[PDB]
Design a protein around this nucleic acid. Sequence first.
RNA 1: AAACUCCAGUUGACACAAAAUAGACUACGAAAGUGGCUUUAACAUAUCUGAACACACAAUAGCUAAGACCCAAACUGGGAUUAGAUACCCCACUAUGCUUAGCCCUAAACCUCAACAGUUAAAUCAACAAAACUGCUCGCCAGAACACUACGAGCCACAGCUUAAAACUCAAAG
Lengths: 23, 72, 122, 48, 86, 128, 58, 137, 74, 97
Amino acid sequence: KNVLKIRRRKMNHHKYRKLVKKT
Amino acid sequence: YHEDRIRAKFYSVYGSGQRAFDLFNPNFKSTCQRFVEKYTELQKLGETDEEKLFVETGKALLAEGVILRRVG
Amino acid sequence: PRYELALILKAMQRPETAATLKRTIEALMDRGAIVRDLENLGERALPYRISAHSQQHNRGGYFLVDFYAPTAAVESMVEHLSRDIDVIRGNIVKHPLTQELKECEGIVPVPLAEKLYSTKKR
Amino acid sequence: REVLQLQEEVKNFITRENLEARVEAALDSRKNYNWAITREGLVVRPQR
Amino acid sequence: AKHLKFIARTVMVQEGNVESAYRTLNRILTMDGLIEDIKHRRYYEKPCRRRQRESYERCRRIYNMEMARKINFLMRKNRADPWQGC
Amino acid sequence: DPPPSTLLKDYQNVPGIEKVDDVVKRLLSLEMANKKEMLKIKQEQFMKKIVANPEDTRSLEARIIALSVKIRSYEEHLEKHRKDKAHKRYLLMSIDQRKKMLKNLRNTNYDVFEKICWGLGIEYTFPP
Amino acid sequence: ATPSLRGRLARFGNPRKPVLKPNKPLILANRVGERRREKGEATCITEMSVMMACWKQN
Amino acid sequence: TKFSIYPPIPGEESSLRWAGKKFEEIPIAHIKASHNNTQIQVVSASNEPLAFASCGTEGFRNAKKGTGIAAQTAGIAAAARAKQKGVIHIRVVVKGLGPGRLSAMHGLIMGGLEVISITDNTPIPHXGCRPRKARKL
Amino acid sequence: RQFSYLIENMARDCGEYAHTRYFRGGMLTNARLLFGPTVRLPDLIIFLHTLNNIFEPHVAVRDAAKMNIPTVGI
Amino acid sequence: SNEDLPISMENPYKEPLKKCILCGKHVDYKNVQLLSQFVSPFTGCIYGRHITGLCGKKQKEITKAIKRAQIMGFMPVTYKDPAYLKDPKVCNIRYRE
RNA sequence: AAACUCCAGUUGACACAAAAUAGACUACGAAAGUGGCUUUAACAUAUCUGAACACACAAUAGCUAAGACCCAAACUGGGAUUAGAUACCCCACUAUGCUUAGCCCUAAACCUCAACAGUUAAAUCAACAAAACUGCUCGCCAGAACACUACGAGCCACAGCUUAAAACUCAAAG
Ligand code: FES
Ligand SMILES: [K+]
Ligand SMILES: [K+]
Ligand SMILES: [K+]
Ligand SMILES: [Mg+2]
Ligand SMILES: [Mg+2]
Ligand SMILES: [Mg+2]
Ligand SMILES: [Mg+2]
Ligand SMILES: [Mg+2]
Ligand SMILES: [Mg+2]
Ligand SMILES: [Mg+2]
Ligand SMILES: [Mg+2]
Ligand SMILES: [Mg+2]
Ligand SMILES: [Mg+2]
Ligand SMILES: [Mg+2]
Ligand SMILES: [Mg+2]
Ligand SMILES: [Mg+2]
Ligand SMILES: [Mg+2]
Ligand SMILES: [Mg+2]
Ligand SMILES: [Mg+2]
């Protein structure tokens, strides 16, 4: 199977951690 | 078959004799079969032990002129 | 239970080797050991250079002590041997002969594993 | 049978009385545990 | 460091035949696994990558040892065609 | 705890062991044996004191006694090895198993359940 | 003898963790791999070296 | 007698002699074959330096030291300096799997030294220090 | 192929037919195209060996059943 | 009925199970002569069972005895003791070819 | 290239680090994990099933405090590459990996295949994968995305973890 579902979740978590750090 | 027990011991003690099996002849009798037939005959007498009965069979064949060279 | 002390002693003259063996056997007895036998395996060249007690040893006297001791004695005896300057190396093992050799009938052959993959056409 | 064998074996155990004598006897003797196996499974003890 | 020197991995030259001696030594090191161990020890193989290689090396042996057993089993049938024409 | 001079359970009934040499007696005693050999004697003492038939090892009573001896051995092991997580699990599981055995005995034979609790000093507690 | 395959693969019967994790199913194909071409090496470096060294000397 | 690949044991008595010298007395040629350099030091049997030559000391620079030809040149240089000090027979001890592992010995032979043995001392840790991380190439 | 010659003689002697050679695809199920529209197919097919030379069922066993031809087979 | 029908037995011709050369013998760590027969003469590496031909039980016993002898000051680690180089060769390995 | 030249090679002395070969073995443990040697203790249950939360555990990373330090090494600095190179390659060195005492409680913690008891005959069977099913029990799942998110609650956790939605949008997602 491809990892396209993981990739969406990967970006969501990345952007969330950056937001929490910024604020 | 019952005689396979005898055949197995004969082949272990003596091995396949130099006499070659002729499987084309439907009535060929190998040295092992001759032993089986004699051993089976002595069993009818009433001997109930293998060791003694086995030893007695070899002696009968030696009297008849069969060559029984043991592996030893 | 029964143990075996594999004692590699420093290569010394007979009077000193006899004192060390007496010293060692008395230490076992002082800790509750019943010493069964003492075997001399002979003086040999050590397999490798062993540095013990600020000395480099190239030869040693191999001795075996067969003794029965309480389980708590083993830890104590190991400490005593660490401080003896005439002992190059001392190891206490459970005697090899307490373990009875199990009876083996021979090698049981194992066939090629089967039905690992389906029999469908690929 | 095990207790009986042990009672016979306990006679030849090293004690504080015979320790010195048993040490001297050990220093004289040699016990070799070395032996080699062959391809036929026969033990070849050392000849020394 | 502690062991005696000039006993391990030492090979004597016969009649100044250095080539044959070096080939012999290299074959001893290969057949024991030293040459392949040295090359793998240059960089750290992480534990997960080492298990993946061992599994790969083990599955290849099995396949390679079973193919060879079939090749030697069928080599008998490389003889000339006995029924040439049918 | 059984005195260290207590003879092993195997040699306690061999005829004439009271007359053997002192050295032989201490070689066949608990002092010269591992910890598991002393636990077999503890089990026998509890079995004789509590169980009606000390030779029936398959009754719910004998099984509670045997497990209680193991529980005590785990408690002593953990007093020295306080960070042994594997044995702490074995202790907690063994305690839960004995509670299930005691619940079954209480439900079936109340007269013997009281003798188990008295002999082994177990206080039965109803679950929350 | 070929290494055993009993309990080596992750199968329903197998209780233990898999020993082997083959990427391809372990089933003999009907072909063998081609003969590999020997990787070329530069020849006559020693003889080249002696000629070039003498050139330097002379 | 049949040729024994196994070296003569120092303690036991052997008949094998090289110019009247026993195996324990022959000078040793220590070759360190690295991935980028080859270093050859010829020492006496009593650990007294006699000759040293590396690919660096022979004028090869940077990536040109890690070549067979460069190691061979170092071998010849070490042999020349060793032969001046009286070395004929040498026991080669090579450690490392670099490009100049074999070439270095050819250089030593081309220089007039006779190799009576070939030992490998490549360091192999039995479990040791964790090596550097794998390169991403 | 050890018995191809024997079998082909036996067929000729009894006035019957033998096909001991490589069985080309469609000999039975595509006969009208291969032989001709008015070709008459066999009424009985006797398999003296039912396996081909890769130890699998001879294709004609399946094709005879498709064409409703009874088959005798060793 | 008939007397010639096959009877039910266990294969009377069955051969005895093969036994490793060390089947039934005590492997002691002190017996370094025996243990040396299963290590490489050049590297001291312990040979695998495909070379030694030992059963799984004896391969473990030999391995554990070697590791004990080596750390207890009985056996060298990096080479085979030269004294034991002439013992009977029992390992199926060819180094010179 | 930088770096080093207080350097390198040989020899001797020399760890609070990591454990060739064996292992082509396939074992131990509930799982996580466990492969140098020795000794001590020691691997629950005589029906099975039974919890995100009770109870006890749980790789790596990380936190708190005290130690050890060979080597490795986030970060950082230098060299090089490049249009740029906050990377890939080279060098150096730190947190960290280790020990002791408490935390934290996550993983592609996946053999993505639940525990127990059976079966190989029928329809064997969407496809692929690691053949298809029966009894019984517990857990869990009901279009995609929003969402390993918001709010509430609990927690030694305070840029955390566990539990976990909706509005708007789409006719697909898979
Ligand atoms: S086959 Fe019996 S121990 Fe090896
Ligand atoms: K190790
Ligand atoms: K959880
Ligand atoms: K997985
Ligand atoms: Mg998103
Ligand atoms: Mg895949
Ligand atoms: Mg520079
Ligand atoms: Mg349960
Ligand atoms: Mg619930
Ligand atoms: Mg954790
Ligand atoms: Mg930490
Ligand atoms: Mg460093
Ligand atoms: Mg640090
Ligand atoms: Mg895992
Ligand atoms: Mg369940
Ligand atoms: Mg089942
Ligand atoms: Mg998460
Ligand atoms: Mg959250
Ligand atoms: Mg809410
Ligand atoms: Mg909140």
